[PDB]
Design a protein around this motif. Structure first.
Motif, PDB file in Angstrom:
ATOM      1  N   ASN A  44      -5.422  -3.560   2.315  1.00 15.94           N
ATOM      2  CA  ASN A  44      -4.076  -3.676   2.865  1.00 15.94           C
ATOM      3  C   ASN A  44      -4.040  -4.601   4.089  1.00 15.94           C
ATOM      4  O   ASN A  44      -3.178  -5.479   4.165  1.00 15.94           O
ATOM      5  N   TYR A  81      -8.731   1.178   0.554  1.00 15.87           N
ATOM      6  CA  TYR A  81      -7.329   0.817   0.514  1.00 15.87           C
ATOM      7  C   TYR A  81      -6.849   0.196   1.813  1.00 15.87           C
ATOM      8  O   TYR A  81      -6.121  -0.780   1.768  1.00 15.87           O
ATOM      9  N   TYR A  83       0.858  -1.176   0.000  1.00 16.48           N
ATOM     10  CA  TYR A  83       0.000   0.000   0.000  1.00 16.48           C
ATOM     11  C   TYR A  83       0.900   1.235   0.000  1.00 16.48           C
ATOM     12  O   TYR A  83       1.716   1.400   0.897  1.00 16.48           O
ATOM     13  N   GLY A 110      -2.229  -7.071   2.104  1.00  8.60           N
ATOM     14  CA  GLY A 110      -1.005  -6.269   1.986  1.00  8.60           C
ATOM     15  C   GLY A 110       0.129  -6.682   2.907  1.00  8.60           C
ATOM     16  O   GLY A 110      -0.055  -7.490   3.805  1.00  8.60           O
TER      17      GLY A 110
END
Ligand SMILES: Nc1ncnc2c1ncn2[C@@H]1O[C@H](COP(=O)(O)OP(=O)(O)O)[C@@H](O)[C@H]1O
Ligand SMILES: Nc1ncnc2c1ncn2[C@@H]1O[C@H](COP(=O)(O)OP(=O)(O)O)[C@@H](O)[C@H]1O
Lengths: 274, 281
Positions: A269, A265, A168, A273
């Motif tokens: 993540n 996001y 990220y 992520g």
């Protein structure tokens, strides 16, 4: 292999521009540490990072626009002694041949980093995606595919099997925004105080790296755009950049600054992520 | 709007791949070429910035030509013009304008200029422009380019670049009256490149080692000097066995990588062309 496609890739897709250093990238300390360790070092010395401990064949950088994904891609190339190829996924849409040619050329220019922007539009046409997966799975070749997206929700489980590390790259924190102003202003005639720098940093909350760069560029043109007629003054005589140039620049950049979905996001993540 | 009659995909190709979205370039990022930099600031950049002041024929030229051997900073200069003028930057090689298909090369030229018009002020940089402006499709794309260059609400600057200025046809040459010679870096410029690039690294070179690096890189381009520093920067990790700063030995090893790619150029041709057709410095 059509020589015109080979030409296009060598001329427009392969990068021939300035190298990028780690210090050019503000913030993203964790991403930079992880990439150095698991990508760049193994790319530089596969004879020692054998395995298993070799570089991944594919990674994903994700986040909102303008946070430094392409910069990081270029930096991976520079710092690993690799060639850099950059293309947006839509430009592949002949598509099958383009994908094949892209990997063929990269193989001739090894080690190579292939940066595909908006890779979500490629991985969701079916025929282009198939040939791309053919190419990445096949990839002994020293090729790294770096995908970038603003839409990680469109990167599915099968795609995550190929892009095995995902990082990220968020909007810059205050320290990173400060970093960018200082770095760009060090290349200019600039008369800002530390207080004024902190004010600029505070007023740029939620700006991307690209917004911070456009802020600074607009600020740099402020002196010339503020002179009134009376042409006596030559370039060396123009006043330095000042806080007012930034306040004016804010009025240009802020209307292009987008307001939101960091949720999406952060969710992704935490799930997939590093 | 002005783009409704172009194919969406041609637009997006130009917007994605041809239009530059990369870091800005500053005058200080360019070593040497003092004359070209000073001249360009005066007759291109200031007029582009203040067209309220630099009106009519004091405006910027519609086109300029940069010429010299490869890797001397022509593209770097093009991008710097755009950065410093507040303009968008589009960069394309002349061969990328051509197509096997009848009528498609002309279409790409027209699309390039139409997108640039939407993104103005704009700098359109065309590499290997001698190929475009050579000497039926070749004739036709040349003609179309000249239509676009000739055709004033427009704030577009065409920057052509070439290693073969002698091959641009005389007629086309009249469109690019300002021609600047961008040569190989002189010693002070080579030194500046090394210093700038090493300032971003952990580096232990003495002043004497730097002077030695400059002496040993006679005839290197700016790109050669850049490759040299890049290779030297990777020396420490490449010297580890199963990290120290960059040292003079890393440059000596780097020289053995870069030097095989450096060969003598026809500098007399460029110097003579600059004297007869160019700005002369
Ligand atoms: N983290 C950063 N540090 C410094 N500059 C940045 C950063 N992120 C973006 N920029 C600036 O904005 C430009 C566009 O960034 P880019 O890497 O293309 O963003 P992305 O691919 O994330 O949209 C860069 O070339 C650089 O000038
Ligand atoms: N005059 C210069 N000063 C600093 N770096 C240079 C210079 N010329 C070339 N370089 C380096 O070489 C790279 C390639 O140069 P470029 O501008 O493409 O050359 P050209 O268009 O003359 O072939 C640049 O991005 C830069 O890193």
């Amino acid at each position: 292999l059509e020589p015109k496609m080979i030409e296009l890739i060598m001329n427009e897709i392969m990068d021939h521009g300035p190298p990028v250093n780690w210090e050019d990238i503000a913030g993203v300390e964790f991403a930079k540490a992880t990439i150095k360790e698991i990508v760049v070092w193994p790319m530089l010395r596969p004879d020692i990072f054998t395995g298993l401990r070799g570089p991944p064949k594919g990674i994903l950088l994700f986040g909102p626009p303008g946070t430094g994904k392409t910069l990081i891609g270029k930096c991976i190339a520079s710092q690993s002694g690799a060639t850099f190829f950059s293309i947006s996924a839509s430009s592949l849409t002949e598509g099958e041949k383009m994908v094949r040619a892209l990997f063929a050329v990269a193989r001739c220019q090894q080690p190579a980093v292939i940066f595909i922007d908006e890779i979500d539009s490629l991985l969701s046409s079916r025929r282009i995606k198939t040939e791309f997966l053919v190419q990445l799975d096949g990839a002994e070749d020293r090729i790294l595919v770096v995908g970038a997206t603003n839409r990680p929700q469109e990167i599915d489980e099968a795609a995550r099997r190929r892009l095995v590390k995902r990082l990220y790259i968020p909007l810059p924190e205050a320290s990173a925004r400060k970093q960018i102003v200082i770095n760009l202003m060090s290349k200019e005639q600039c008369c800002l105080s530390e207080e004024e720098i902190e004010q600029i940093v505070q007023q740029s909350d939620a700006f991307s790296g690209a917004d911070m760069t456009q802020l600074c560029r607009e600020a740099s043109l402020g002196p010339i755009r503020s002179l009134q007629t009376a042409a006596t003054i030559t370039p060396d005589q123009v006043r330095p950049i000042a806080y007012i140039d930034f306040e004016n620049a804010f009025r240009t950049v802020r209307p292009s600054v987008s307001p939101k979905d960091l949720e999406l996001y952060e969710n992704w993540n935490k799930t997939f992520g590093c």
